[PDB]
Structure 1
Amino acid sequence: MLKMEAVPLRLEHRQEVIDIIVASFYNKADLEQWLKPGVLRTDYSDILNDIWNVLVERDLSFVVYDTNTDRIIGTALNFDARNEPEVDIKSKLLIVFEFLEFCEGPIRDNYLPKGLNQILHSFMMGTAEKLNPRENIACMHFMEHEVLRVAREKQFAGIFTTNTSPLTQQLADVYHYKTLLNFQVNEYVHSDGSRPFGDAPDEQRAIVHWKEV
């Protein structure tokens, strides 16, 4: 059995968190696959290095240790949705973040509560690369359960994120997240007029989830 514990994000965790995020988003993210070629591993580490200081001092993120091996197997990066640092991304990841604002924007500022310390935005979540299906699912259940803990403890109103993989979308529904948008990713039109995820099947969705604490 996998026994885990949650530990607040520290400055030393920079390389371990990045390697978990890179070994979980690169070539596995359901959105960036349709933007090939032109998505590199450093495109995620560049964004992480840009906000690593802000991410640690906000005191909302954590890593997950395997207490048996005392090593990091997962991490959950979170921000105040009304206090997120804005990055100037220069790769094709800007298209992804503009699309996530397409989904999150109109809902966050017109339906979710106003003011700070209200919306805890689940920014990123990852697990170690060589985890088996049992440990990866167990780690996702642990990170989901612990994100709720951080929300209630920090006196937030709810948790809010956009789920782009079928596993996170099913975990969210199973965890009683309310669905506020089930957008079809191949219908999104970029500013240049094209559809960057246009080659995606109609079954691939971008679901905007929200859950009160």
Structure 2
Amino acid sequence: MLKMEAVPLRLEHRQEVIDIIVASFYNKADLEQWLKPGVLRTDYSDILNDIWNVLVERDLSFVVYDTNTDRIIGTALNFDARNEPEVDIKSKLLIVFEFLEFCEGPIRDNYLPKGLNQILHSFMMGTAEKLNPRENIACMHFMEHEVLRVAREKQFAGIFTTNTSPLTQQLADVYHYKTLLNFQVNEYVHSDGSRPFGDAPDEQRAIVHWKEV
């Protein structure tokens, strides 16, 4: 049985966290797959490197250790939704983040609690590539359990996230997140009038999720 431990993010975790995020998102993320070609592994590391110091400083994120191997198998990256660093994104990932803001912005700024230390933004989550289904689902359960604990211990009002894969969307549902938006990603229009995810099937959703703690 997989034995796990959540450890706050430290500065030295940078490459391990990058490895896990890159392996979790590159060629696997449901949104970026429609922006091919030209989405590179470094587009993810470039973002993480730019925010890494603030990400550790804010003390809201953590890594998950397999305590039997003492290696990192997962990570949950969190910010105060109203106190996030500003990243100038150069890659096609800017479209992903502008879409996510399209999903989150209206709801966050008009329906969720105002002020700092209210909205724990679970903005990135990843698990190690070598995890089998039983290790991955359990790491996902464990990080969900720990994100809630961080939210309560840090006195946030709730956990805010946009889930873009069927598994994370279904996980959020059985964890009793409320759906605040279920957007059909192939209907999103870019600033140039194109639908960057237009080739996606109608069934691919972006779901904004929110759970009061």
**TM class, shorter-chain normalised?**
over 0.9
Return the alpha-carbon distance in structure 2 between the equivalents of residues 138 and 173 of structure 1. 16
- Deviation (angstroms), 1:209: 0.2
For structure 2, which runs of at least 5 residues remain unmatched after alignment? none
Return the alpha-carbon distance in structure 1 between the equivalents of residues 113 and 131 of structure 2. 37
Q: Which runs of 4+ in 1 moved over 6 A?
A: none
Residues 160-196 of structure 1: CA distance to partner in whole angstroms, max 9, x if unpaired?
0000000000000000000000000000000000000
- Name the structure 2 match of 1:154: 154
Return the alpha-carbon distance in structure 1 between the equivalents of residues 86 and 31 of structure 2. 20
Q: Secondary structure of the equivalent of 2:110? A: coil
TM-score (normalizing by structure 1) = 1.00
Return the alpha-carbon distance in structure 1 between the equivalents of residues 86 and 172 of structure 2. 26
Return the alpha-carbon distance in structure 1 between the equivalents of residues 180 and 7 of structure 2. 31
Q: Secondary structure of the equivalent of 1:6? A: strand
Residues 117-155 of structure 1: CA distance to partner in whole angstroms, max 9, x if unpaired?
000000100000011100000000000000000000000
Count the aligned residue pairs. Answer: 213
- Deviation (angstroms), 1:84: 0.3
After TM superposition, list the pairs within 5 Å mapping 1:176-191 onto structure 2. Answer: 176-191=176-191
Return the alpha-carbon distance in structure 2 between the equivalents of residues 121 and 36 of structure 1. 27
Residue 66, structure 1, aligned to residue 66, structure 2? yes
Return the alpha-carbon distance in structure 2 between the equivalents of residues 95 and 190 of structure 1. 8
Residues 30-83 of structure 1: CA distance to partner in whole angstroms, max 9, x if unpaired?
000000001000000000000000000000000000000000000000000000
Return the alpha-carbon distance in structure 2 between the equivalents of residues 161 and 123 of structure 1. 6
- Deviation (angstroms), 1:6: 0.4
Q: Secondary structure of the equivalent of 1:109? A: helix
- Deviation (angstroms), 1:86: 1.1
Residues 99-129 of structure 1: CA distance to partner in whole angstroms, max 9, x if unpaired?
0000000000000000000000001000000
Return the alpha-carbon distance in structure 2 between the equivalents of residues 36 and 123 of structure 1. 22
Q: Secondary structure of the equivalent of 2:146? A: helix
Task: Calculate percent identity across the aligned residue pairs.
Answer: 100
- Deviation (angstroms), 1:15: 0.4
- The Cα RMSD (Å) is 0.3
Return the alpha-carbon distance in structure 2 between the equivalents of residues 60 and 49 of structure 1. 17
Return the alpha-carbon distance in structure 1 between the equivalents of residues 2 and 96 of structure 2. 34
TM-score (normalizing by structure 2) = 1.00
Q: Secondary structure of the equivalent of 1:73? A: strand
Return the alpha-carbon distance in structure 1 between the equivalents of residues 123 and 179 of structure 2. 17
Return the alpha-carbon distance in structure 2 between the equivalents of residues 123 and 83 of structure 1. 13
For structure 1, which runs of at least 5 residues remain unmatched after alignment? none
Q: Secondary structure of the equivalent of 1:173? A: helix
